[PDB]
Every structure is written in structure tokens, then in C-alpha cells.
């Protein structure tokens, strides 16, 4: 099967929420992405509704032609929204109310019960769960044990590497983590900080199932337009695999 | 002489600052806009460097092929920077820091002395001053008496009008204010809230020298790309005048 | 006051409804059209929901950046839906459950009580009413007398003209009818059967406020794409006025 | 031997037939498609001529630069039309006058005499026959036994799969069925319900000769234009094979 | 009314007829032209079928969305074909079997009876006749007297002018001829040798109803593509009139 | 090494020569093609200067950025011009003057001495010689014995095959001939009649060095423009080899 | 009638001559420009052949579809080249210190016999002569006295104005000089330093016959490509006259 | 893994410096290239600042989203600039006669102490150093001996080959030199004179890390625009490795 691309459109909403106006509309962006290389659309419903809103989730759930990947913190509010929304995928992330963006991976190994119940609860509601974690063997083994079918490896450290060596070290760390996760029966994704110049090495990793990318695509889109921004990212991804 | 377009690129920076990375870069957005219909580039340096930064102003000042319109609050920090930067145009606006955007016009009539000096100060630097004000005769007479070459009428109320009637009222108000301003020897600009659907009626106002538009252009841009977004806005404006 | 274009996206749904699938989605078409020259989006909620559905109307009302023009028959059902949806505009038309399309013109002059009540009811909910009528001064006088602020002249006979002379005659007739309409205080729109080759003569009529075009645009769109189809239509319309 | 694409333009006519007008014209669509990646054009001449008409078939047979694949039910009428038109390919399908679309699969195993005669008759006129069947080895063995050189596996159950597991199962089933088909000397096509997101798994099946896709392409076309819609589909198909 | 453009597609056929292949097909070119600025499609059925064939006329007559302008010599063969074909317009030209192209205008003043019967015969068959003639008062008066509703002034001499003065003289000669023709009640067209650099002066002439252009459009199309080639010619024409 | 594309621009001239004007100009068409996938430009100087002229060869020789492939008949006039012009490649073909195009291959086996000298003569000028021949071993052995570096297999019969079977026969014949030619140390090219739909099977033949294609490319060009036409042909060829 | 644009392609050669290679080729740039809004092509053959070369001139003279405007210094070498070349226009420019004014134009009032001689000589050969001069009444009287039919006003000072005031002044001086020149029977062009942002004010001057623009267009072309850069400039010019 | 492309934007500055103006601006060309396939940007800061200037370097260092490859001659001025500039890469090149070999590369084997010194010094500052040298074993041993981590092979001879044979020879010599260089622990780049038609053979060499290309891309850009020129070059490179 081919490498999939999940396009995170949160930042379309962050441009909108800077004013009280309704544009640009994430609902439009999703249609564009889905027709230009996206295999899924991702939204992170933050507790503070900083960008994506309940209104967005609600309409997107009815308009997406592919499937929704709902990113959210593991809280009662979100599990409840998640269960009612029935998104195809749900990606559990850690979240501070005023963090710049998603900081690190979930602390699964240190909250086994909490994650186990959440996975169970989402799974009963027919949602395929993905735990966003660091390329960390302990967290990976834990994710598998709490029952999650997917993990999504945080590519931030790789993305922020300051030197070519630091970068190669993070790459290898991620590739090995991915291999270990698959050996435990997990399906594995990756995301955060992926760009047009750093994505191919990540996409070359065989175990990768889907990459979730947002900011870099939206950043290219304001110059170039979303359609091309997405098509270009999807092109580079398949090139790395061929 | 033709109606001019000033593109505000603040929101390119908004998108960039949502994260710690450097893209999208306001410097790229300016080249694009200048080559697609913009006659000048506007940047608003907020006290809280929310979006546009000193870095941005410093490089932009060296890369713009047209000219800078520096929107700023009337404070000593800003006046010093302006005198220092020598932007072709300077647009004085009220500011609070935690504001969603620039609300209404400047209280010029109520601070004649403070405005009188800033105008003289900036003009001695060879900068052309624009006072962002409400479509209010008291304020226009003030701006005139104080010596500012330009005023920029706030189109916010017109943009937010809730009914067709309310819109029409706000329009006639801006149109009558523009004629009045012109009769006092002021050159008049307009801006804030202008979109692809409400710009023409404002562009048709004879006295209008330049319209400063930002958010609606960036909003169209994440869908179509900055180039077409700017070219479209400019096309609508020239059509209005024709 | 620029000639406006209202894009009827009914036929996007005509294509969607031929199968059980959900694409093409009217919601996407609306965003494209509103950004390519459409000043308003029009949908005909038929008694038989052959294309636009309650879902489309419910979501469109939330995603439209411009304004909805709800075409509907005068029935208790429709009037209830309209009062609740609160479209910006509402266009009342004659409906025969099994018709190929709107055959043409409401009999207002013979149902003044019915139309009078409909108009008031919709106006009470804040909806600007448009009575779809033939280029007939008796019908027009009636529309004015019943209180509708708008009328839309049926351009179908003009569109189906079999000879250049028949066409010329229906043009003159539409033109005289529109001038009469305006002298009564009515705002006048026109629609049905307009094409890329017959639209200019109608757009040239000075009294025209908005043209409502659907089928020709969708027919061009499957070939060239909605964006260019809408833009071309709007371009020809503005050329006619110049 | 490259995977071929057969573009079914039935739905261009679906849009044309909603009115009395003659556009969009299937004849134009055919030229566009044949020049954008289509290797053959497909039309379904329905008993009720709801879309493609005798005119379309008569003109298409003269304007096609590639080859026609006539989809039709097995009736004396159709067989007579086919013998006279002499399409390069003919695809026999089950037809119920009022169906939404081809429901799926001919019952060949239970009408061997009928199908045997049809196949011979068409082959006598030089037409290469294709029996549209379900991924069913009994039906497939029969198609081979009756003398048809081609079969087209119905991909509808796979397209309408409600769960990833159901989908995976219909894929495996289509795949095993195709391999069995080939071992019998049959050439195997596939069609119905294929989309931009579900086409690769089908295109990857090595035995596949030509995919016949219609609705998804037209649905994308109203948005982006036929040319790009066909090209995108063909591009994804060739990527799956590589 | 706006200046119309009749696109002559003969040369699409001349490229085709250089081989025994069927491409490029005039039928495709006509659809493109008609959707890119053409108001009518012109074909010259030559006695030697050098480019356009009976097959072309026959299919075009069924596919054109606008109307056909049949150019032909005044011979029994053509009058008969013309009457059976019932094209909207028929343009009578003089013709040698092996001339490079149409050489000059019809000799109407010297074949009054012949032209009178031909006009009559075509007119009974409901065809609007146009006599292609030189910008010559005697020929123009004659055309009017023999009954033709249209004349088409040969722009060849203007097109071939060797010097700027020779050119200005031909321009004036054509403008005066056009004025004289209109004064006699004739509707007037122009064509032959019109290019992207010489068309505007011709289009600026008020009496001009439709320009018929071929070679230059096809010559640009091989580089640029027909759509743009036509749109560009149509753009220049309307510019000259505004 | 990759499969090369040689674009024959003769038919650009065909279109130009249909009239007395200078457009379209082969010189423009060459720049376009060289920048869109062509690795060389081919021009066939016919004795009757039907399309390409001495002017064309003289300027082209100075403007080509890649290299010229001069197709000519084996006559003294031509040999002299070739020796004079110094084209990188020279392709010897049979010619009659009133022929629709180049029919079959050169009779090399039957004129060994004449061909032996032309080859030696041209090679002494530093020109690489290609003998246009039929996929016939007798001719290939002849071309080998005579000293020509290259042979170009005539793909005409393959292009004209009337049935799928006949096509397959012609293909295997060209494929086996190419391998044979290669085994005798000849470099092999192919051409004549290659289209967008039959090129791949020929491109896939391993031994093929360069395919010379003209008419189908010019034919696509009047619709889409030379650039896309060439780029498309080249894309299909590289796909075949991959 | 129509304001004309002459594109100076000198800097195409400037980029080519930076190396020993032949690309980019001015011959190609000329075809692009002539089909994108250029009404003529300008090349300045410098004595030192810094950019444009003898071959450029020789070949361009055979490939231009419009006309050549040969720019040259007044020497015997150039007069003989121009006489032999027969360009349509010749623009005499200063190339040495003993030829220019303190501003940049050709010193005509100081070389009256030389110019009188060049003018008469070029004219005998059928070349229309333009004298490149300053917006200077003395030089203009001189040009009129000497026999030149055209003058081309140097817009450099205007283009280099450092302040708005300074710019308005130079504009004025050019406009006045244009009116003055016209009153003496001279046709007048303008050029040097014209850009996308300063051209409209110059285009609006009514007496302007043609604007000669080079560097800004090529400067834009490296980013957007020559076609759009030329088209855009022409569009801006026509907007200025509407 | 992926072959990389470094775009040299020197000639953007070459076109700008031909005048006193600031356009075209290298800062813009860099954003375009980095988003169109460039993996790095190269600027050669010449002692004479013929094209790239100090401001270019200073600003580019702050705007590049990828990395800078500073090309410079080995002098104290440049070493200090590079040390202070901290570009990611530095490519040492000959700028004076007493620095080059008879071919074009830097004479390392003849200035071993100087290079050993530059290499060590740049390295201490974190700059990866590349020595631009000939496909010469002696210079390569020297570069290895001296400590440089990279060499960039001069492809000029290969690019200027006058005959196919001559070209195959230089290709071979480059390939051998690449393998040899790699065997000594050096990473290797290539560049100078690479074009759209000669790059694939160089890209196919496995040891190649990055190709540095400038003039051909800018040469193409003036025609097609920088974005497509960069994209096209990158596409050709990747095709070569597939
Ligand atoms: C779990 C997860 N995956 C992917 C992303 C996408 O990150 P980026 O916007 O950096 O591409 C995010 C950012 O919210 C995330 O939180
Ligand atoms: C202070 C200020 N902010 C922003 C803008 C532009 O705002 P908007 O983004 O709505 O066009 C203007 C121009 O009126 C302005 O003066
Ligand atoms: C009242 C009215 N106006 C305009 C239209 C649009 O018509 P068309 O699809 O013919 O463009 C319709 C569709 O029936 C309509 O009912
Ligand atoms: C009567 C007539 N009008 C117009 C044309 C178009 O001429 P051109 O191909 O030169 O544009 C022709 C050429 O056949 C013609 O004969
Ligand atoms: C003599 C000759 N003519 C024409 C061509 C190209 O022909 P076509 O136009 O069919 O590609 C070739 C290349 O085979 C050729 O050798
Ligand atoms: C006489 C003349 N006119 C116009 C131009 C065009 O100047 P620019 O390249 O500045 O647009 C030039 C420069 O070659 C010139 O010499
Ligand atoms: C060391 C080096 N590499 C690569 C290049 C690129 O050369 P070209 O401009 O010929 O593509 C240059 C020329 O600046 C160079 O000096």
C-alpha cells in the first residue's frame, strides 16, 4: 500500500480566528486538500478553540469525502466529543492550554490506566486510536500494551535538529522506533515539523503508514495556493518511496 | 491618476509566528504582491511584535521595490523607529496590545497637540503622514488643522454593517466624509475590513487615493496563492473606477 | 452599482443525485463560485428534492460567505423552511412536481391574496422577496402591488427564441418590462436560460440588478472547471455594461 | 503492457438531459478525455436513453480517435444496434429500466445459451465482447466457457465497503477472481464505483487490463475541468503499477 | 450590440488532410473556439474538398452550439448542398479550384442575374446570405440590389499593404465602403488576412458587424493552443471598440 | 542513457505555406520544442520545398540549441546541401514529390553502391547517417554492410494496422528487427505515424535510440499548444521505458 | 489610435553574452514578445556589440513578424548597416561623451549637420528616424529643424526621481515637451527606465505614440516568464488610456 | 539519498547590475528556487562584486529557508567574510591567473599550504568546505590531503565538448574521477555549464551528492519563469537516478 498523507488544516483556522470574520473557511480547505493528494483531513480540537471550532468539526464531519483524524487531549470533554463525533481516527496528544503547538509525545508509560480506558472508550465507539509519542521504546511498548492500534511518532526533534549530525541521529532514532513499533504489531504514523525539504527521509522509512502535516503546507499555500501546496508534498512523499 | 492598492502583509507574519519556524516569510509575500497589483506594502509594527517584527521592517525596507507604509501607534518608541526607518508613508493608529485588530480611528480632535508634534516630527524626517480616522467631520477638521498630508478613513463599520440598509448608510457616510476631507486639502485613503465583495463601492468613491487591504487578501491567498489574490483585488478596484 | 451575478448550483446536485455517493458537493461549488465572480449563491429546494437537499441548505446557510437566494414554490412547507432558514433572498416560482425545470412566471395577478400573504410573512422574517414573473406589465404591476421589493423576469422565452427576429422581440419586451418594473419602485433581476452567447443583451439592460444563472455555467464547468466558468460569465456581464 | 483507462462519459449527458438544451456535449468531452489520458471512451446506451442517445453514439463513432466501448443490456434491440455500430468493444450488463445505475453482474452461469449466442453474434460483427460480472469464479468460468474474450469485474461491492476490513476483503476477492480469470485465457477489466481514493488498490492488481471509470471523473470535472480530472485518474493508475 | 467574431477553422482541416489520419478534428476545434470567444464558426466547403469535407459540414451542423457560416462558390453543387444543410449564414465567394486561398471579391455587378437567383434560392431556404466583395462602391450597390442582407468586405489588400501609407489608404477605403454599404441598408462584415497586429483598426470601424478570421488564429494556436488564440483575438477586437 | 525524442516540425511549415504569409514560423516552433522535451529537431527538405525551405534550414541551423536531423532524399542537390549545412544527423529517405508523405523505407539492399557513397560522403563531412528503412532483415544487413551508423525503422505499418492482432504482429516485427539491427552494431531509431496512443509500445523496445515524431505532435499542438504537446509525448515515452 | 509598445530585448543578449553559450537567444524572446503585446521589437546594435550582435540583427530581420527598431549611434559603420538592413525604424542614440547632453539624450542641437545628414540618408533608404532626446525644447527644435519625423523622449530623469514632488515635476516636463514636440509636426515616443509602477503616467500622455521598454520587462521575465511580463506591461499601458 | 540541486542565482544579480536599479532582486529568486526544487542556494561573492553584493549575502543569510553555499576565492577578505557569515557551505574557487589550472578548476596541488589553511580555518567556524577542481587525480589527491570534506568537479569541459565522442570521453573522465574521489573519503559535487540537455548523464553518476547549476536555469527562466525552470531541472535530475 502507498504512503498516505493526512493534511492538518488547523492553521487555516488560525488565520480566520485572528479576526471575527468567517474566512478563510477550513471546510473549503478540506475539499481542496482531499482533491489534491490528501488521503485524510486532520483537525486538532483544542480546549481553547484557538483555531478549529466545534462548528468546524461538526460541518467537516458532514463534508469530508475521505475521513477525519481528530487530534485532542485525553480529557472527559474530548473523549465525550470524540465519542459523539465518531471520527474515523482520533489522535491522542498531550496539551497545555497556551503552548505554542503540540510540544512532545503523550506520557503513555506513565499513565497506563488512563490511556487504556481512553483507548477502550474510543474503540467501543468504533474509533481507530493513535497515540502521539516520542521515538521512545518505553513509550512504544506501553502504547502497544494499553491497546492502541496506532502510534504517531513525533518528528519535531528531527525537524529542529541544529546540525546535519543531530538530524541524522534523530532520523535513525525514528527509523528504529518505527521498526520496533511494527514488530509489536502497531501501525505507525509520523508528524510535526515535516517540511518540503525534510519530509523525504521520513517518508523513506518503510513502516510509515501516514504522515500528518500542517503548518508547512499552509505556509506554502499562502504563497502558492493550497492545491499545489498539497500536491507538491504528496509528490515528494511518493518519490521518496519509489 | 489611478486608485492605488496598498497590501497589508501583517497576516503572513501571523501565520509564521503561530510556530517557531521562519515561514511563510513576509519578505517573499511583498515581492509577490508588488508584482501583482500592489502599489505599496503596509506593515503594522505592534508594540507586542505580534506578527511583523523589527527584523521584518529592517529587511523589507531594503527589499521593497515600491514603498513602505508603516502603521504604528503614536508613542516615542515608534516615532523613533519611524524617523529611523524613513518609510515613505506612516499611518498613525490607536492600539492596545491585546486587541483583535485596529478597532476605530485615532482620537485626533481630542489630542491635537500630541498629533501636531508627531506629524511635524515625522514630516521633518521626510515621511508622509496618514492619520487613521473615523468618517467623522470633527476628526477630519482636526487632522486638517494639525497638518497631516493624509487621513485614512476607517471602513470597519461599513464592512460590519449587519443589513443592506445599514451598509448603504455607512457608505454614504464614508463618501461624504471623503469629499469633505478632500475639500480641506487632505488626500484620503480608506481601509480595514475591505473584502472582494465590498471593495468596489468604496473604490468607486472619487476622492479615494489608496485603499489599504490585508486580511481578506491573505485569506483568499491560502486558497489561490498571493499573486492571484492581489491581482483580483486590484482588478475589482480598477473596474469600480471605470 | 455593478450588475451582480447569482450562481445557481442546483445542477451540481443533479450530478450528485444520479448516484448514492456524496460528490460533487454543492458546498464546495459554492466556495469556488463565490470566489470566482458570484455575488450570491442560489439553490432551488424542490418539493421532490431531486437535487438540492435539506442538508445542502442547512450547511450552505453556514458556509456561504455571501448570501443565499432560496428558490422555492409558494407552499406551507417551503414558507416554513424559508422562515426558519432566513435566506438573505427568497425567489418564489411556479412548481409542478414533475417538470423539467421552472416553466416560467408566477401568476401573481390572479393570486394577489396568496402572494400578498407570502410576501408579508417572508418579509417579517427579514427575507427580501423576489417574485419570478414573465415580462408582463400586468404581472409586474401586481408584484409591486402585493409588496414584493423584487421581481425576476423570466428570460426563458428569450433564450428559446427560434429566429433572430423572435429573439429581438423578446429582448425588447424584457427591456420595456424592466423599465416599467423600476418605475414602480421594484428592483429587477432576470434569469433562466441565460448562456455565454445570449447573456450580454440581457446584462446591457440598465435596470437589471442581478442575473441568476445556473445550467450554462455548470455545463461549461464540466469542461473547463467551475472557477473559469463563473469568471467568464461575470466578465461578459461587466463587458455588456461598459 | 500499460494499464489502460476507459472514460465513461454517460454523466456528461446526464447533465445535458436535465434540460432541453444540447450542452454539455458528450462529443466534446470525448475529445478532451482521449487527449488527457483516456485510452478508450465508454458510453452506456440505456433502454430508456436517459443520457447517451442514438445521436451521441452515431456521432461519437465518427469522431472518436481511439475506440468505443458500448455498454448495453442483452436485448434484441441493443444487439442489433451494436452489430450495426460495430464498436471496438462491447460490454454486456444487467439492466433494469428504472435502476439508479448498473446494479452489478450478469448472470452468465444461468443463461449460458443466451450469452453464448450474444457473444458469437457480436464476435461475428468483429466486436470484442466483455461480460460484466461479479468477482465470482462460477460466473467467471462461465464467461470463459461461453466464449467471451473479456470480462469486467464489478468493483461496486469494494467501492461501497462500510469498513476497512470489508473493503480489504472485497479487494482480495477481486484480486483472486482476476487471477483465476486470467488462468482461463480471459482478459480482465474492472469498473463501477472507482474513485480517486480507492483506485490504486484495484490498479495494482496485475491482471487488470483496463479500468472503466465514469462518475468520479465527471464529479471531479465540474470542479476542476475534465482534462485535469482524466489526467489525475490516469496518473494515479500508473503510480499504482509502479 | 457587440462586434462578433466568426472563426474560420478550415486550416485545422488542412493540417489533417496532409495525411490520411483523422486528427486534428475540426469538430473539436469548433467546440474550443465557441467556448473561447467565437460567436460563429466558419467553414469553406471547396469544390476540391482540400480541407473541410462533406463529413465535416455534416457533423459540425449537428455539434455547433452557435451557428455555421458556410463559405462556398456560387455553383449548382454548392447551392444544392447549402439548401440541404440550412446553415444560418452562407458567404458567397469566388473560387478557382487551385488558388492559394480566396483571391478577391465576388464579381456581383457583373453577374447580377446569377447572384440575384442565388440569393433568392438561399433565402427561400431560410439562409442569411453574405456576399464577399471588395471595398468597391459599384460592387456594394450591386450586392444591395441583388437582395443580399450582408456583404463581407475583403480585407486582404489592407492586410497586404507594403507601406504604412498604402495601409492607411486601404483602411480608409474600407471604412468608407462600410459606411456606404450601411447607408444602403446592408449589414457588413470583414475578413481575410486579419491578424493580431492589424485587426484593431478594422474592428474600430462602427459599421462592422462580424469579422471572420482563420489563418492567423490557427497560426497562433499551434504555438499557443486554440482556446487562447481565439480569446486573444476576441479581446483585441472588443478593446478596439471601447 | 534515456530514450530520446526528435520532433519533426515540417507541418508547422505546412500550415505556413498554405498561405503567402510568414507564420507560423518553424524557427519559433523549434525553440519551444527544444525546451519542452525534444532532444533534437528534424526537418525534411523535400525537392519540392513543400513545407520546410532553404531559408528554414539556414536559420534553424543557426538557432537550434540542440541539433538538426536533416531528412532528405539521396540526390546530388541534397547531398551537396547536407555537406554544406553540416547537420549533426542526416536521415536518408525515399521521395517522389507528389507523395502525401514518406511511404516506406529506403531500398538499400537494392542500391548498395549509391548508399555506400552517400554514407561515406556525408560521414566525411562529419555528419552521422541514418538510413530510413523497413523492419526488414535484408535491408538491415544491407545498411550494416554499407557502413551507416544509424537506421530508422519505419513504424508506418504498425501505425496503420487495422486490427489489434495486425498491430501486435507489426510490433513484434519492429522489435525483432531492432534487436537484429543492434546485433550488427547499428544504432536504431524509429518513426512515422507514432501517436500519443501507440508510442509507448514502441518506446518500450530496448534498442530504440530516438523516435522521430511530427504530425501527431503538431496535430495535438493546434489544440493545446506546442509546449504541452511535446512534453506529453516525451512523458509517455519515458514512462514506457520505466 | 492605440498606444504602442516596443520591447527592447537587449538584456536577453546581456544574459547570453555573460558566457560563451548561445542561450538565451534573442530570436526566441522576440517571437514571445510579438505574440504577447509587443507591437515592435527594439535592439540596440552597439559598436562594441556588448549584447546584441550582427547575427542577432541579421536573423531577427528575417524572423520578426512585426518590425524592427534598430537603435544605433550616429557613425558611418551604423548608417551603412542600417541602410543595408532596412529596419522599419531607426533610433539614433548617443554612445560617446561627445554626443550626450548632461542628461542622457542625443545632442542634436550641437551636431546639427551630422544629424541632418543621418536623417536625410536613412530616409532615402525608407527608414523612419527617431532621435532619442531630452525633454528639452532646444533639442526638440533642433530635431524638428533637422528633418527627423520622430523624437523619443528620455524618461530616465522621471524614472529616477527621488521624491514624489521631484517625480511630478519630471512628468510635467515630459508632458509639456510632448505637446511642444507635436506642435512642431513631430511624432513622439518615450522610453528608458519605464517600469510596471511608473509607466501609466507616461502612457496617459496623449501625444505618446509608442513606449520603448526593456530592462523592467526582462527583470520581471526572469521571475514570471517573458510572455506574462510583456502582456502585463501592455495591459497597464492600455488601462492608462482608458 | 536524493541527488540534490544547488541553484546559483549569480546571474539574477548580473541582470540587475546592468543598470543602477535594484530589480531583479536575488532575494526573491532565492525564495522561488527554494520552493521549486532547489535544496540550497549558491552565490559567488566576487572580489569585484560584479554581480552578487555584500548586501545580497547579508540579506540572503537571513531569508534563505534552506542553506547558503558561499562561493569565494581564497583571500583573507573572503575567509573573514565567510567566517563571520557562517554559511553552511563554502566553495573555494580560482579568481586570478595564479590560481587556476589550464582547465578552470582551483589549483590545489600547487597551493597546498594555502588550501590546507583555508580548509582548517573555515572548518573551525563550522563551514563545510568544497574545493572546485578539475576531474584530475592529482588535484583530487591534493584536496583529500589538504582536509576538504567536499570537492566539486568542473563539468565545463564536458559541457563544451564539440563532438559526441569528445563528450562521452569527458563524461567518462568525470565518472572515473568521482569514483576515485569517493575512494579517498571525499563527498563530491559537480557543476559549471550543466544544461537541460546535458545534465542527466552527470546526474546518473552515483557518487554525485549535489549539482550546482546557474546560467542555464536563469537562461530558461527569462522565457518560462524561474519556478518552472528550477522544477524542470530537478525533475530531469531525479529521472536520471530512476
Ligand atoms: C499529533 C500531531 N501530528 C501532526 C501535526 C502537524 O504538525 P505540523 O503543523 O508541524 O505539520 C501536529 C500539530 O498539531 C500534531 O499535534
Ligand atoms: C491599522 C490597520 N490595520 C489593518 C488594516 C488592513 O486591514 P484589513 O486586514 O481588514 O484589510 C488597515 C488598513 O485600513 C489599518 O489601517
Ligand atoms: C427563478 C429562476 N431563476 C434562474 C434560474 C437559473 O436558470 P438556468 O439554470 O436556466 O441558468 C432558475 C432555475 O430554474 C430559476 O428557477
Ligand atoms: C470570405 C472569407 N472570409 C474570411 C476568411 C478568413 O481568412 P483568413 O484565414 O485570412 O483569416 C476567408 C478565407 O477563406 C474567406 O474566404
Ligand atoms: C521521412 C520522415 N517523415 C516524417 C517523419 C515523422 O512522421 P510523423 O509525422 O508521422 O511522426 C519521419 C520520422 O520517421 C520520417 O523519417
Ligand atoms: C533610446 C532608448 N529607448 C528605450 C530604452 C529602454 O530602456 P529600459 O531598458 O530602461 O526599459 C533604451 C535602452 O536601451 C533606449 O536606449
Ligand atoms: C564552482 C561553481 N559551480 C557551479 C557553477 C554554476 O555554473 P553554471 O552557471 O554554468 O550553471 C559555478 C558558476 O558560478 C561555479 O563557479
Short mmCIF file of C-alpha atoms in Angstrom, two decimals, chain D residues 94-175:
data_model
loop_
_atom_site.label_atom_id
_atom_site.label_comp_id
_atom_site.label_asym_id
_atom_site.label_seq_id
_atom_site.Cartn_x
_atom_site.Cartn_y
_atom_site.Cartn_z
CA UNK D 94 -27.74 -6.39 -16.45
CA UNK D 95 -30.31 -3.65 -16.98
CA UNK D 96 -33.45 -2.83 -15.04
CA UNK D 97 -35.24 0.08 -16.74
CA UNK D 98 -35.62 2.20 -13.58
CA UNK D 99 -32.32 1.44 -11.77
CA UNK D 100 -30.08 4.13 -10.32
CA UNK D 101 -27.16 2.55 -12.22
CA UNK D 102 -25.79 -0.85 -13.25
CA UNK D 103 -26.58 -2.83 -10.06
CA UNK D 104 -23.93 -5.39 -10.87
CA UNK D 105 -23.01 -8.57 -12.69
CA UNK D 106 -24.63 -10.54 -15.46
CA UNK D 107 -25.94 -13.94 -14.52
CA UNK D 108 -23.92 -15.76 -17.11
CA UNK D 109 -23.80 -19.16 -15.37
CA UNK D 110 -27.59 -19.27 -15.53
CA UNK D 111 -28.07 -18.05 -19.11
CA UNK D 112 -25.25 -19.79 -20.92
CA UNK D 113 -27.30 -20.28 -24.12
CA UNK D 114 -28.35 -16.60 -24.25
CA UNK D 115 -24.88 -15.26 -23.52
CA UNK D 116 -23.29 -17.83 -25.81
CA UNK D 117 -25.39 -16.57 -28.72
CA UNK D 118 -24.85 -12.93 -27.87
CA UNK D 119 -21.10 -13.40 -27.75
CA UNK D 120 -21.00 -15.22 -31.08
CA UNK D 121 -23.27 -12.70 -32.77
CA UNK D 122 -21.16 -9.71 -31.66
CA UNK D 123 -17.93 -11.53 -32.45
CA UNK D 124 -19.27 -12.17 -35.97
CA UNK D 125 -19.55 -8.40 -36.48
CA UNK D 126 -15.97 -8.05 -35.27
CA UNK D 127 -16.77 -6.73 -31.79
CA UNK D 128 -14.59 -7.81 -28.83
CA UNK D 129 -17.11 -8.77 -26.13
CA UNK D 130 -16.82 -8.06 -22.42
CA UNK D 131 -19.11 -9.70 -19.88
CA UNK D 132 -19.65 -7.51 -16.82
CA UNK D 133 -19.60 -9.95 -13.88
CA UNK D 134 -19.18 -10.17 -10.09
CA UNK D 135 -15.88 -11.37 -8.61
CA UNK D 136 -17.34 -14.92 -8.64
CA UNK D 137 -15.40 -17.88 -10.00
CA UNK D 138 -18.57 -19.69 -11.10
CA UNK D 139 -19.60 -16.67 -13.17
CA UNK D 140 -16.07 -16.24 -14.46
CA UNK D 141 -15.70 -19.89 -15.53
CA UNK D 142 -18.99 -19.48 -17.38
CA UNK D 143 -17.91 -16.31 -19.17
CA UNK D 144 -14.88 -18.17 -20.42
CA UNK D 145 -16.98 -21.19 -21.39
CA UNK D 146 -19.44 -19.05 -23.36
CA UNK D 147 -16.63 -17.63 -25.49
CA UNK D 148 -16.25 -14.03 -24.34
CA UNK D 149 -12.64 -12.84 -24.70
CA UNK D 150 -13.14 -10.32 -21.88
CA UNK D 151 -14.83 -9.96 -18.51
CA UNK D 152 -15.03 -6.82 -16.38
CA UNK D 153 -15.18 -7.42 -12.63
CA UNK D 154 -17.78 -5.34 -10.80
CA UNK D 155 -15.89 -3.24 -8.24
CA UNK D 156 -19.06 -1.89 -6.67
CA UNK D 157 -19.07 -4.03 -3.52
CA UNK D 158 -15.49 -3.00 -2.99
CA UNK D 159 -16.38 0.68 -3.51
CA UNK D 160 -19.31 0.63 -1.10
CA UNK D 161 -17.41 -1.24 1.63
CA UNK D 162 -18.56 0.12 5.02
CA UNK D 163 -15.42 -0.85 6.98
CA UNK D 164 -11.74 -1.05 6.16
CA UNK D 165 -11.99 -4.82 6.81
CA UNK D 166 -14.93 -5.30 4.46
CA UNK D 167 -13.00 -3.33 1.85
CA UNK D 168 -9.86 -5.37 2.35
CA UNK D 169 -11.93 -8.50 1.87
CA UNK D 170 -13.55 -7.35 -1.40
CA UNK D 171 -10.09 -6.35 -2.69
CA UNK D 172 -8.67 -9.82 -2.01
CA UNK D 173 -11.76 -11.29 -3.61
CA UNK D 174 -11.45 -9.12 -6.74
CA UNK D 175 -7.75 -9.97 -6.89
#
